[PDB]
Symmetry: D2
Subunit: 256 residues, 4 copies
């Protein structure tokens, strides 16, 4: 591919799921990709699979891991053009009274501060390349979700942070955007469904939450990411919905 | 009541449903209310019922009716403080290929231009009173609805128009806001449900579209309207959602 | 290009400005493009310029023009995959009291019903191709604009209509999305600025309304359109903002 | 007043600014109000001033303070109907590279987790009263702000959390809403302006960010809060904008 040839991209949580779909999309567009992940299994195999992708073990909640991620990226490839903050986690459904402040803080540490930390360490290099930041948020940050108060809050923060940072970095020509996926079929979706009383039914309800009648694919998030990086030069601070239309119209969720 | 004492309010489509609930709320707040409606039956009885409400027959799609509505309001009460553009219609569910351009134009004539015309004729008097405009839009203008392309489009236009007019009239201290109700139990809802194969089931689905598990009441829209008129002095161009939370979260509406 | 090879695209108002930028983007992606415009000058030259683009004279407010546009497209190219409803107009700045209902109706005829009519005539063919609709709306439909009540209202309607139609056509795999550009430097922008007391200053204010410090280009809208057509297969009913961040943060627009 | 007579309201950060305006509004509506604040000076004087208001020293970042706030409220007044999470802080303008993860965590501790903690401890009592939660967020959570990445992120989280909790508590008839104020003239605004090179100019720019040409007042936020508590019985999960129209239209913030 030539759409993003000669560019260098870091993707966190790139070892599986949406992150791996994003990794593949950027490789297909001609970019060199650093795969960052806290687990080795998926990311290491993906490095072997994809010419132009390399794997760096890095836990985004550990600032020294992230500092080394950036320095190794520059040392090995000489520039940095795009950072995709995809690493994140959705806890199992929890009622509000079943949540804790410390569990909330830990989820904020991954979903929000890890995104914050990599972005901050990368920005000096992005400014030199007039690169861009892509945060992976969630539709539920905008519309809410049941039994997920901490998760929804972290994603509301990421989407808002994307806009604030877009304002700050616009004078330097660094664009900052986010993608808000809806139901994307990933290993995380599969794992969460398996915890449920009826996994197959939970999966069917998840497919039917979209007017398109299916869940999305990691490759479709990946294509949205490559668009924001390579072709959306007048887009900054936007929230790109990749949701199959889940937010549209009425659904199941006289005046007394 | 004293919240809006000494003020004069015009409510279109005030003879039944949401409009009548709005009429009652303003009367309860101490205002004098002109009830405008194209049908006499509901509005005339409401005038007899409510001290401080009077009924003026007026079809908002007829500019001469609307001109007389405003002039009679000033002649009889000496001022005009608030205009509530509530008159509107929801056609029966229609597939896109079952719609027509001329049916679309007629619906725009009622839901949009009738609101436009009364607002324009009222604004010279609202400027003198530092009054305000309240348009009744719909949640489906913001999130869409199935089998209602013309209706949804008219309400998208009303909500947008509310913001444009708010900008234009802010130098004169005239506020312009809208209410976007979701499912409100009114004679219109009842009539539309009766057209359906299973009316009782359509009504149950309508109640369940809200997390609160019920439809809203005209009185609840009325309270929102009295708030915008009497107490929201720093609110202009807002869309006040009165929807029971229908827009929140996933509902019924693997990656292949 | 190969991103949209073998596909057939109709672009209305394709003779200049954003429409011509969209035409060029689809030609660059390998598509055959029918340029529709009410004026011959730009579109005819563009047909001569671009192999794979042809010009069909068509006023989208004339249903017989639009019927012939679709039938000629099928007759000459054998399929139809994407319709881009770009034709539209922004009147000069007008205060609300300077507007008329009939001027409002005429603007609705172009900006809204022309989009409605082509979409309706095209949908049987889009369903056969699992094609898609792209409406060009405006950021001011979502946030309002001063001295543009009719224009803002037409664009609020287009954005809302996009969501309603997305719901209706999702069972058939036809996606329906819109692009909301902000300030894009086009012949229309230039013409409107020339009417102003100080054109150069109006143009400078227009550049500064964006955090990126410039207006957008038609080519950038074109790239967004090609993305929605060719790569956003899980996107339907979305509003893709192409605005340079104009909607972000505070600007120029103690408590007494 | 009688609008909220016999009800018991807790307002955090109630000692000055928006919180004190909210306290006064609920007292004026007939409610008994517990003023919570980490500083004694404002809240203690307000207790002496207002019959029906009492002051409880409580730092919302200290879970034992908050536990005692709730238990003392029940012990002294026998019920709890409304919690207004107003306590929060806006740091001085900081460039992204001038922020720290630990400063971010501390701001999240106040603006987000303090709101989370009081809400969680209050909900068993709100469920018994079918009471409601009102979170004070900010417009900049939705539209972003320059030099305020941590602040904007905390408010994006609060707004999103409001919707998630609304979903969770709707089965119990507990409504959860938020107010997003724009520029409100408070001691915090005054203090931040005084740090600036030109305070008077910063204040003038702040007034002009609104189409209404002024900042808002705490009393106007207070009226919005009393509406959500006492009269918005079909509103849950909404974001009530109290911004003077700052989010509307273009402002200061050719295609190259
Ligand atoms: N799957 C969906 O439906 C969905 C929807 C909306 C948003 N999202 C978001 O998309 C992102 C990816 O989700 P997914 O479904 O692909 O998840 P996933 O669990 O399948 O994969 C996430 C990857 O990130 C890695 N990761 C987790 N914590 C990490 C850390 N501390 N440091 C580095 N890597 C770490 C994991 O090891 C894994 O490889 C998340 O931010 C999630 O919130 C997912
Ligand atoms: N009912 C809902 O669930 C719902 C939801 C969202 C928005 N709305 C909007 O609320 C408004 C009122 O709806 P409703 O359900 O109360 O409807 P309704 O049919 O019960 O009452 C509407 C009233 O307006 C009058 N009216 C209609 N056309 C008129 C005209 N040309 N001139 C003057 N009066 C006219 C009718 O005679 C009637 O009295 C409409 O704008 C509607 O789109 C309704
Ligand atoms: N320029 C901007 O800043 C801007 C911003 C947001 C949205 N938009 C929208 O983008 C679209 C294009 O705007 P532009 O600035 O390129 O305008 P433009 O005036 O430069 O070009 C519009 C083209 O459409 C054609 N057209 C007009 N009426 C037509 C009709 N009845 N039938 C067929 N063709 C017709 C014109 O002849 C012209 O070739 C419009 O819908 C406009 O509202 C523009
Ligand atoms: N002023 C504005 O323009 C503005 C705009 C939007 C949102 N807001 C929000 O409104 C709220 C109030 O802002 P304000 O301008 O009135 O601020 P303020 O500084 O004038 O008053 C805030 C009050 O909260 C108290 N407080 C702070 N930390 C506390 C803690 N840990 N525990 C208990 N009380 C604590 C302070 O002592 C003070 O009395 C905040 O959440 C703020 O983010 C303000
Ligand atoms: C019944 C319920 C289900 C989930 C759930 C189940 C599987 C996967 C996910 C998930 O990872 C997800 C799904 C949609 C999103 F927009 C998103 O950001 C993440 N969630 C969560 C909460 C629930 O109350
Ligand atoms: C199955 C279906 C139902 C309706 C329907 C049925 C009864 C009443 C209404 C209605 O008057 C309404 C309902 C909600 C709104 F936000 C609104 O502005 C109006 N609508 C419409 C379309 C449908 O595809
Ligand atoms: C001072 C003022 C200016 C304009 C104006 C001037 C030049 C071009 C345009 C325009 O065509 C446009 C600009 C932005 C949009 F989002 C859009 O859909 C169209 N508008 C309009 C109104 C005004 O009160
Ligand atoms: C030049 C600049 C100014 C501020 C600033 C100055 C005074 C007060 C505030 C404030 O407390 C505030 C203002 C608006 C809000 F919507 C809000 O939630 C809080 N802010 C902040 C950042 C800046 O880059
Ligand atoms: Na490799
Ligand atoms: Na009477
Ligand atoms: Na050609
Ligand atoms: Na007292």
């Amino acid at each position: 591919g030539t759409r993003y040839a000669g560019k260098v991209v870091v993707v966190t949580g790139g070892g599986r799921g949406i992150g791996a779909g994003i990794v593949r999309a950027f490789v297909n567009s001609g970019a060199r990709v650093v795969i960052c992940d806290k687990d080795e299994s998926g990311g290491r195999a993906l490095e072997q699979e994809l010419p132009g992708a390399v794997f760096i073990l890095c836990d985004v909640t550990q600032e020294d891991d992230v500092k080394t991620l950036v320095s190794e990226t520059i040392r090995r490839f000489g520039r940095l053009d795009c950072v995709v903050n995809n690493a994140g986690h959705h806890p199992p459904p929890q009622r509000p009274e079943e949540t804790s402040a410390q569990g909330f803080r830990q989820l904020l540490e991954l979903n929000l501060l890890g995104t914050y930390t990599l972005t901050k360490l990368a920005l000096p290099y992005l400014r030199k390349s007039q690169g861009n930041v892509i945060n992976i948020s969630s539709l539920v940050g905008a519309i809410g979700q049941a039994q997920a108060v901490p998760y929804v809050a972290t994603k509301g923060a990421v989407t808002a942070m994307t806009k604030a940072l877009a304002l700050d970095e616009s004078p330097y020509g660094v664009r900052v955007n986010c993608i808000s996926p809806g139901n994307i079929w990933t290993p995380l979706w599969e794992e969460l469904a398996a915890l449920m009383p009826d996994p197959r039914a939970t999966i069917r309800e998840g497919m039917l939450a979209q007017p398109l009648g299916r869940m999305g694919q990691p490759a479709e998030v990946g294509a949205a990411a490559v668009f924001l990086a390579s072709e959306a030069n007048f887009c900054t601070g936007i929230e790109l919905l990749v949701t199959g239309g889940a937010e549209l119209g009425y659904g199941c969720k006289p005046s007394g």
